[PDB]
Design a protein around this ligand. Structure first.
Ligand SMILES: Nc1ncnc2c1ncn2[C@@H]1O[C@H](COP(=O)(O)O)[C@@H](O)[C@H]1O
Ligand SMILES: Nc1ncnc2c1ncn2[C@@H]1O[C@H](COP(=O)(O)O)[C@@H](O)[C@H]1O
Ligand SMILES: Nc1ncnc2c1ncn2[C@@H]1O[C@H](COP(=O)(O)O)[C@@H](O)[C@H]1O
Ligand SMILES: Nc1ncnc2c1ncn2[C@@H]1O[C@H](COP(=O)(O)O)[C@@H](O)[C@H]1O
Lengths: 301, 318
């Protein structure tokens, strides 16, 4: 129960130290009756300078900045994520291999750019109000936190989302969906990221579609009102039988944790679990929406 | 469980914030087999800028420095203080009293000190530690628990935290400060409810502390080690702080206190009230005393001061 912050790179240690520090600080901050406009222009900044102290895993000097901590904490709640669990997932052991997941595979940690953080600030109020209005049920990425790490004078920005894939069920094939297809090198990768054409070709498909579609619609409409585009539908495929070849039954999962998961219908060829959510809304659009919205509807049932 | 760090002076809020913050970080830092020489030049430093966030009680901007945290954690241990207890006394509720504070539960004293004071702590720290080791924590000396530097509105403030020389429960009805010439309470001092009396008062009122022979010896043996140690460090002009608790007077005071509301006695855990001594079963009055050396930090010398200081107290007791 002693949290060393041991990690491969020091920046990951700082991240671990950071999430720990801020989540603890928040536990002393009252949950407010509503977010306020300043909450969206707020930050926490902490600077550490430790001389001859506690430098076994942490750098002696580093900065850690959390953007809009009241907003992201509310988002956490609206996504049904407990702060202490969020903290544990980041903090209990180093994140694993810019794109990481927490060791328990529940949360993804993505390095991003100055402008991305700008774009997020740009959409945050609306994104929030929408998560409110849609009562949390949505295929959009779920933003759990956003941070700036300063290590060795270098700034690094990170965004934490909920993993689209199960944290336990092994994924057997990945499709990026918006003309485009998979490259040789990639087609020669342990887990290849296929694209639209490799899908219609593979005749790949089997369900929920009614509620997935009415959900996905509202989303893309939202992304249009924000004049965003060029984003994909990440689709995951877990082949139950394959995985099979004191128990953890095949195709078994906690829908409250693997939030994007749907089991295959009865009349489905091979028993599968699907993972689907919208990814990368951060960086004709009004048409991208209607186009995207239908290319997807043709991959269900 | 929510701690708001509510306190009159933002400085106090920050003190609470800092003791809290540092104690938790220490909890994630393994306990070493021994202290290393660097631990005595070590420090932590944290600077906070909280923009439009979390400002009910804390300033948006402040700095907290803890000197030699490894050494002070270990000192706490040697003194039988648990870090959670310590943390809780500082943070559960604001310190009471700026220059001279007690934690809300009266376990710990927090005093503002000068930069010189802080420098003198470093000078003497390696030796003071060693001494605390070889006397097993058994000492009339001030028991140092933490040293800190707070920055609020660009203004730096140094603080040293000690264990209270007095009981955290038992009332003091009379205190003294003793050195060993021409010392006594001013006419202004006496005007206070709890006047701080001095050497010629203690003598001119013919006071004696009746602790009995077994205690008197155990006490003078401590004093002897402590004051010599203080000699070798060339340290001078420290006082013996003397508090007196009148058991019967207190029991009546308690009674009166309940009667107001409506409309054991002389007992102390020697592991908490560490300087306290029961009066001999043959004293004229039922009393508890508290005696400790105070002001180690800041015409003869140290060797003489130790000898003199020593022989005075020796007489104070029976
Ligand atoms: N395992 C994952 N869980 C959640 N999101 C992911 C995952 N892998 C990739 N993404 C998102 O998908 C985008 C990249 O997908 P791709 O480059 O098509 O593999 C990035 O914005 C990621 O945030
Ligand atoms: N490691 C140290 N050793 C000796 N003196 C120190 C040390 N650190 C600080 N001091 C003294 O403490 C006072 C205030 O220190 P600070 O404000 O931390 O720089 C100054 O008189 C310093 O010289
Ligand atoms: N209860 C106490 N515990 C520890 N030190 C004290 C206590 N009361 C006073 N002092 C210190 O003893 C010296 C004389 O304090 P005073 O009672 O104001 O004369 C000063 O160094 C005070 O900071
Ligand atoms: N048992 C007692 N011992 C000593 N003084 C008392 C006692 N009871 C009352 N007194 C004092 O007599 C006065 C009247 O007390 P009270 O009975 O509370 O009005 C007060 O000064 C009390 O302090």
């Amino acid at each position: 129960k002693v949290k060393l912050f041991r990690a491969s790179e020091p920046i990951l240690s700082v991240l671990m130290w950071g999430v720990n520090h801020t989540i603890n600080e928040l536990s002393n901050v009252p949950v407010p009756v509503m977010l306020m406009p300043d909450d969206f222009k707020a930050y926490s900044k902490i600077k550490v300078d430790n001389h001859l102290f506690n430098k076994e895993n942490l750098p002696s000097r580093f900065k850690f900045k959390e953007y809009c901590p009241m907003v992201f904490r509310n988002l956490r709640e609206r996504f049904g994520i407990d702060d202490q669990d969020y903290q544990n997932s980041v903090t209990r052991s180093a994140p694993i291999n810019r794109f990481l997941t927490t060791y328990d595979r529940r949360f993804v940690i993505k390095t991003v750019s100055s402008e991305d953080v700008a774009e997020m600030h740009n959409i945050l109020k609306k994104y929030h109000q929408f998560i409110v209005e849609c009562h949390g049920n949505t295929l959009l990425p779920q933003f759990l936190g956003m941070y700036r790490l300063t290590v060795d004078g270098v700034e690094t920005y990170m965004v934490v989302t909920r993993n689209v894939f199960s944290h336990r069920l092994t994924v057997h094939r990945k499709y990026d969906l918006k003309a485009r297809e998979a490259s040789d090198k990639e087609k020669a990768k342990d887990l290849p990221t296929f694209k639209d054409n490799d899908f219609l070709n593979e005749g790949q498909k089997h369900v929920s579609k009614k509620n997935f579609l009415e959900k996905l619609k509202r989303d893309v409409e939202f992304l249009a009102q924000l004049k965003i585009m060029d984003y994909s539908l990440l689709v995951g495929i877990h082949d139950v039988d394959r995985a099979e070849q004191r128990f953890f039954g095949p195709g078994e999962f906690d829908p409250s944790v693997d939030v994007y998961a749907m089991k295959s219908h009865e009349s489905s060829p091979k028993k599968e679990v699907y993972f689907m959510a919208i990814a990368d809304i951060l960086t004709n659009p009004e048409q991208y929406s209607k186009r995207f919205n239908e290319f997807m509807s043709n991959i269900l049932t």
